[PDB]
Write a protein that binds this ligand. Structure first.
Ligand code: HEM
Ligand SMILES: CC1(C)[C@@H]2CC[C@@]1(C)C(=O)C2
Ligand SMILES: [K+]
Length: 405
């Protein structure tokens, strides 16, 4: 379904990419998005899919647009417009200077100091999960580890009951990769309906959990409001439930298929943090955007006030102008350039948590299950959206070749 071309959009800039179902998805979702970087596609294009919006395809343009909040506002950051309009999460729906007091609170709850405190718990949950799985010689990685590991950590941090995960996880996914069963707004309001009473409970009798801390936070010489607390906690949930979860699967699918890269990390565990960064570049997975606050000419293209522009975080590290042989995974890549965690004032507040979760997974998995592969003949299917994902990841291994810790 192609929305008719706006008058200011030249025909030669039309490239009808569908971010929710790209044509070459079978090849892998990063491969599919990478068609935007083939020689036939201009650096900045208009797609008529999903209501009609711009797409920047190059690292340099993506970075520039993310720095320039004056022209490119976060107020409406999702495609389609209906989602972007309904999107009211804090701090990401705000531009500076208003954004700044809230970002600092968010940093306080999921930032590095909190990760440092959680190190042992992170280690423990990973080891316990992996030790439980090891004697099986098989798992569906997405549901047996990729989901429970970072989600149980977040749920613990947020002080929310684990029994609520299936319901909460379902709703989160409707905001990033919708079933078609709910609109973005329904899912958001459902999440909000869950949060509202808890936030009230924790303003009256605060705890030490992340939600108590947000709800009782100080921003700008005043306490956060109940509704502001609600909008920040909703975003923290989504970050906790639908980011690392998907990334781990892209990484493990790759490792399962490439024993040499596994052996590299097994024999040289000191290369794991470097590997994690390269994996973050190659299997980048997030794409949101901004909305034009005024008419603006950007790299020779006129944008009209109210135009939406998708600025795919995924695309920067896959840009050959940024990394030679971008689809090639090289753990000793001299300069790993990417914007997987974003760019400008909205750069991911949870990046340290993500990195810790990844590096711990890489270390403890390869230690206990050094040798594994994708199940015989099984076809790996990726899913595309605001955050991309892996639908299923069946793995098999000989437990004899596995090592108990
Ligand atoms: C590999 C994992 C992750 C990736 C790739 C990722 C990606 C991103 C990106 C691209 C942005 C900026 C979006 C924009 O500019 O519109 C962002 C922001 C944010 N992320 Fe992450 N994220 C990850 C993990 C997490 C985790 C685990 C949390 C923990 C709750 C989290 C919490 C947040 C928050 C609160 C923001 C908003 C910061 C602001 O608006 O100032 N993220 N993330
Ligand atoms: C784009 C994101 C990855 C970032 C954290 C969750 C997410 C979906 C957002 O709405 C902000
Ligand atoms: K909005």
């Amino acid at each position: 379904n192609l929305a008719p071309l706006p008058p200011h959009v030249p025909e030669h800039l039309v490239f009808d990419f569908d971010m929710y179902n790209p044509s070459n998805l079978s090849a892998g979702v990063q491969e599919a998005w990478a068609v935007l970087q083939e020689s036939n596609v201009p650096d900045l294009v208009w797609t008529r899919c999903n209501g009609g919006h711009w797409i920047a395809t190059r690292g340099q343009l993506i970075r520039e647009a993310y720095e320039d909040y004056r022209h490119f506002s976060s107020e409406c950051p999702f495609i389609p417009r209906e989602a972007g309009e309904a999107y009211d999460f804090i701090p990401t729906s705000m531009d500076p200077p208003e954004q700044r007091q809230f970002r600092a609170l968010a940093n306080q709850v999921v930032g590095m100091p909190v990760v440092d405190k959680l190190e042992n718990r992170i280690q423990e949950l990973a080891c316990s999960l992996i030790e439980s799985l090891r004697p099986q010689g098989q798992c569906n990685f997405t549901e047996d580890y990729a989901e429970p590991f970072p989600i149980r950590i977040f749920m613990l941090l947020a002080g929310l009951p684990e029994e609520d995960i299936p319901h909460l996880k379902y709703l989160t996914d409707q905001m990033t990769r919708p079933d078609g069963s709910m609109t973005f707004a329904e899912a958001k309001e459902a999440l909000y309906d869950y949060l509202i009473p808890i936030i009230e409970q924790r303003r009256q009798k605060p705890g030490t959990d992340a939600i108590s801390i947000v709800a009782n936070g100080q921003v700008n010489g005043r306490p956060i409001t109940s509704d502001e607390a609600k909008r920040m906690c909703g975003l923290l949930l989504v970050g906790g439930l639908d980011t690392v979860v998907n990334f781990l699967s892209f990484s493990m699918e790759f490792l399962a298929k490439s024993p040499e890269h596994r052996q590299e990390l097994i024999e040289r565990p000191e290369r794991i943090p470097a590997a994690c960064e390269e994996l973050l570049r190659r299997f980048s997975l997030v794409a949101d955007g901004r909305i034009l606050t005024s008419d603006y000419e950007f790299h020779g293209v006129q944008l009209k006030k109210g135009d939406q522009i998708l600025l795919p975080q995924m695309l920067s590290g896959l840009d050959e102008r940024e990394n030679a042989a971008p689809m090639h995974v090289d753990f000793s890549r001299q300069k790993v350039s990417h914007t997987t965690f974003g760019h400008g004032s909205h750069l991911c507040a949870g990046q340290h948590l993500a990195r810790r979760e990844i590096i711990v997974t890489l270390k403890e998995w390869l230690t206990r299950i050094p040798d594994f592969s994708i199940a015989p003949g099984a076809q790996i299917q990726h899913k595309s959206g605001i955050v991309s994902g892996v639908q299923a990841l069946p793995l098999v291994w000989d437990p004899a070749t596995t090592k108990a810790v």
